[PDB]
């Protein structure tokens, strides 16, 4: 009934409290649960939901055979209530997509689902599940987008898409979407930057995006912009490097740190003045563990000193993609935009001996109150029957 | 839309009528049903729901292997409609928790879910499924709470939490929670009392809690308090001892009866003037059977004389935890707060030869009208193929 204002700033936050956990894979041992990946969260003014990409197959069935290329015509984007297992019986269909995004504007859901061939992919935009627009690949090379929630403000929702090489210069676009129709589109001019899999959030009527540099940066690149798509760019300066893989922590850069800069994971961070809350794997070579770190001058300064770290998943357990999501005043009752986050806990291939690959998920929400480090890992015993 | 007044007294009640039974374990023989425990009930102004703790695993699947410690990071608090099997397909996610409580204030649900390490557990409070507060362990020793419904009155909800040893003096707190934010917290001064797993209910704008003494009492301890957390304390005087294990009935005490006072079960009772309705196992050594007893002067007097007993589960059948829950006028239409109760019927370990441990549930509601003794046991044939 009413569009989200998005005009307040981010809630101050001293730590992260556990919010959900689905246990998908443990349950899927016997239940009817989808093989999934990219399990992001996004919230309405009424409820929070997890969105995900199915291969269109169930844990412990032959069609979970992972020989299928990542971008198949079977892949679809679906959603289920937060913390429930993604099951064919409790899940809503959203889009035919092998790359996706989603957000609610206070009135309805927007979804963005990219399918088609590598040289000609089309994003289809729906608003209340009705197709409202489309956009074709413009560099003819794997049009792709966030794998997490877009950000809405003042009745407009905002996303980032990338088309081009994943290991060289590519083309980056920001879009302003209104009621599921693209109303503005800007190609960023960012030579020597790589933007992929952006985690965008709203904060005082502007959007900020922390993304993945898959070409040559082990710190994360950021882009931020207002409702007119007047933008700025950079990289997180903290020497607590955010990507994976990455070197050991040392003096950072405000441009891409080339050292172990190739490849990466979807990740996120939250800006607070000159400070930054950083989410990252614990391992430096591999997608293992997860910790949150507060670096008071980390956004704009290049040292290693941080004030506090909070454990989320032990170094010895499997993690994967991570992403931002927020809860607005319109949902929470607060005077500020509450930052949360979710973590994909990848099981199966390539690191273990199975024919398949599936995520479980955890999430936390930031609070300015008591919290504790722990490990909340997937917990499925592998391999399975199949 | 309107907060529960909680100002009327408890409905007079001559016996207990059957309300629900889920048959979880019989059905789970084939269905997709969670391994569960702590299966308590709580009611809104619109519907009653059963809440429960999953290990995140299904009956007849390898992950039901009960080698997992009780307080794992896989444990979560979920709910399903009353009398339906707790299934991944029909259940709502609530909190990541290995100890929990829940109640509705007339406007929304509050949930309380404790997770984290033994030396640093955090309770996370949600209101309409939004995190609204948290509280850390203050004795650094297994912060834990009711395993049944909190009690709400006049827009405030009330609970009890314990931190410390389970076999010596510990620390007991009562809390006043308002819209999911803790607004008052009192540490009770009760030397030589042990409070655990409290069954609290409202009655004339005050809360009364009957709990478990796991240190040295086979009668149950009580604490009662008003909205300002001005409290009083004692133990149920009746010589019809309430806990399990316990001695044979003889003269009671208004302090802890040390005889067979170690260990126990979650239980409940309802106060009526000097009288008491007592729920208890039938066996004196083991968690078998269940009966309700009316002892007219049992709250404040120490003899064995009771006026009536009503059978619920035969001595020969398995039982387990039990707990209060009530139905307000705002739900029922009545001028009084109706007392009900639920019984966990534990199957599997440690008493039987399975790798797992799961509850079924039954419930009854008090009426001032005709009723009958019977036995309504679990009825699953053990073991299962796993």
């Amino acid at each position: 009934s009413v569009k989200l204002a998005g005009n307040s700033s981010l809630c101050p936050v001293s730590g992260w409290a556990i919010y959900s956990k689905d246990n998908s894979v443990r349950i899927g041992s016997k239940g009817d649960v989808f093989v999934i990946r990219e399990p992001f969260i996004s919230c309405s003014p009424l409820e929070c939901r997890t969105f995900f990409l199915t291969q269109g197959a169930l844990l412990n069935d032959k069609h979970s055979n992972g020989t299928i290329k990542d971008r198949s015509p079977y892949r679809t984007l679906m959603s289920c209530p937060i913390g429930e297992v993604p099951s064919p019986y409790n899940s809503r269909f959203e889009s035919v997509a092998w790359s996706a995004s989603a957000c609610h504007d206070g009135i309805n859901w927007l979804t963005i689902g990219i399918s088609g061939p590598d040289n000609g992919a089309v994003a289809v935009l729906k608003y209340n599940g009705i197709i409202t627009d489309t956009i074709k690949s413009w560099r003819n090379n794997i049009l792709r987008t966030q794998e997490s929630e877009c950000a809405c403000v003042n009745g407009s929702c905002f996303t980032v898409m990338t088309d081009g090489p994943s290991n060289g210069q590519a083309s980056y676009k920001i879009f302003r979407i209104e009621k599921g129709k693209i109303v503005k589109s800007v190609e960023m001019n960012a030579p020597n930057y790589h933007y992929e899999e952006c985690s965008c959030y709203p904060d005082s009527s502007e959007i900020t995006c922390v993304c993945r540099d898959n070409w040559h940066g082990s710190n994360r690149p950021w882009v931020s912009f207002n409702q007119n798509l007047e933008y700025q760019i950079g990289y997180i300066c903290s020497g607590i490097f955010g990507d994976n893989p990455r070197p050991n922590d040392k003096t950072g850069s405000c441009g891409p740190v080339s050292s172990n800069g190739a490849n990466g994971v979807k990740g996120f961070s939250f800006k607070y003045g000159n400070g930054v809350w950083i989410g990252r794997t614990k391992s430096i070579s591999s997608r293992n563990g997860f910790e949150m770190i507060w670096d008071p001058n980390g956004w704009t300064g290049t040292d290693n000193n941080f004030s506090i770290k909070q454990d989320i998943v032990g170094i010895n357990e499997w993690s994967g993609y991570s992403g931002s999501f927020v809860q607005h005043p319109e949902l929470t009752g607060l005077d500020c935009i509450r930052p949360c986050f979710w973590v994909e806990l990848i099981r199966g291939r390539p690191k273990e001996n199975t024919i398949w690959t599936s995520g479980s998920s955890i999430s936390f929400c930031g609070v300015n109150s008591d919290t504790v480090g722990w490990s909340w890992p997937d917990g499925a015993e592998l391999p399975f029957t199949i | 839309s309107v907060k529960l007044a909680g100002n009327s007294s408890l409905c007079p009640v001559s016996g207990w009528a059957i309300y629900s039974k889920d048959n979880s374990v019989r059905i789970g023989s084939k269905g997709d049903v969670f391994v569960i425990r702590e299966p308590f009930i709580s009611c809104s102004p619109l519907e009653c729901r059963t809440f429960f703790l999953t290990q995140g695993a299904l009956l007849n699947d390898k992950h039901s292997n009960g080698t997992i410690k009780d307080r794992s990071p896989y444990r979560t608090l979920m709910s399903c409609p009353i009398g339906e099997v707790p299934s991944p397909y029909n259940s709502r996610f609530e909190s990541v928790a290995w100890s929990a409580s829940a109640c509705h204030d007339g406007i929304n649900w509050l949930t309380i879910g404790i997770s984290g390490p033994d030396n640093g557990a955090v309770a996370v409070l949600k209101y309409n499924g939004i995190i609204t507060d948290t509280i850390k362990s203050w004795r650094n020793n297994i912060l834990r709470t009711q395993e049944s419904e909190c009690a709400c009155v006049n827009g405030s909800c009330f609970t009890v939490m314990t931190d410390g040893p389970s076999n010596g003096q510990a620390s007991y707190k009562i809390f006043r929670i308002e819209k999911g934010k803790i607004v008052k917290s009192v540490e009770m001064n009760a030397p030589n009392y042990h409070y655990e797993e409290c069954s609290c209910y409202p009655d004339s704008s005050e809360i009364t809690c009957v709990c478990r003494d796991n240190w040295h009492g086979s009668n149950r301890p009580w604490v009662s308090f008003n909205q300002n957390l001005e409290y009083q304390i004692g133990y149920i005087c009746s010589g019809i001892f309430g806990d399990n294990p316990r001695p044979n009935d003889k003269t009671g005490s208004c302090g802890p009866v040390s005889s067979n006072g170690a260990n126990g079960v979650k239980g409940f009772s309802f106060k009526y003037g000097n009288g008491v309705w007592i729920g208890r196992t039938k066996s004196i050594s083991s968690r078998n059977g269940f009966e309700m007893i009316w002892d007219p002067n049992g709250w404040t007097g120490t003899d064995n004389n009771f006026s009536i007993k009503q059978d619920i589960v035969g001595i020969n059948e398995w039982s387990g935890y039990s707990g209060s829950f009530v139905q307000h006028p705002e739900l029922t239409g009545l001028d009084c707060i109706r007392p009900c109760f639920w019984v966990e019927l534990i199957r599997g370990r440690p008493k039987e030869n399975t790798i797992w441990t799961s509850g079924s549930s039954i419930s009854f509601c008090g009426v001032n009208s005709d009723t009958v003794g019977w036995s309504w046991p679990d009825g699953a044939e053990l073991p299962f193929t796993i």
Partner: antibody
Amino acid sequence: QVKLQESGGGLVQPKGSLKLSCAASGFTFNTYAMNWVRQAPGKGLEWVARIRSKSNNYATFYADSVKDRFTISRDDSQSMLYLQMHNLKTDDTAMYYCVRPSIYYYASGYLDVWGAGTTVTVSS
Amino acid sequence: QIVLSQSPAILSASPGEKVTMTCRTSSSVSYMHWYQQKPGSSPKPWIYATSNLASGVPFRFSGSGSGTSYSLTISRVEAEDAATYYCQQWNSNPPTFGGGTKLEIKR
């Protein structure tokens, strides 16, 4: 571990100036109001000043005994709290403490962390 | 401007005795906090919101009261308990502390 290491103390003449500092670690300094409380030799405790968080506009409050002479401030990006003292008097001689208050709504005013403190002597 | 008066100023007790120290207010407050100071160290947070014990405080301690009268009690005093206990309120600006009660061991 949450810690507050203050510094800046010392000997200074009546009418003089001093800038006490406090380095905080172990928590998110930016989310918290902060306090200075002091203690004259042998004499007990006296709150002096309070500054609030960014999200409450860094609002400042002072004890009358210190009003118009002391200024409180913070640099969140460095986790520092400051107390500038001007026009010192022999009365202001005291042990000065950096003090975090409890975030608990149900215990407003509880001061949950103290530093070791820094010593101030005002004498000619 | 809200005043706190603690009594007695000094209190002598044999180990094992029960002792109580009191803190009165010029006008009403919701609750009282207390701190423990030994000479040569910072106060320690001892109790909050009248009755809640700080981590590390042993069960011998308990705290009570309401309106304008509060107290701190030690069921069986031990020698390590010898210190000065200060009460403190923050119901209204400014926050204020009592004058302290100094606990001494008899022998």
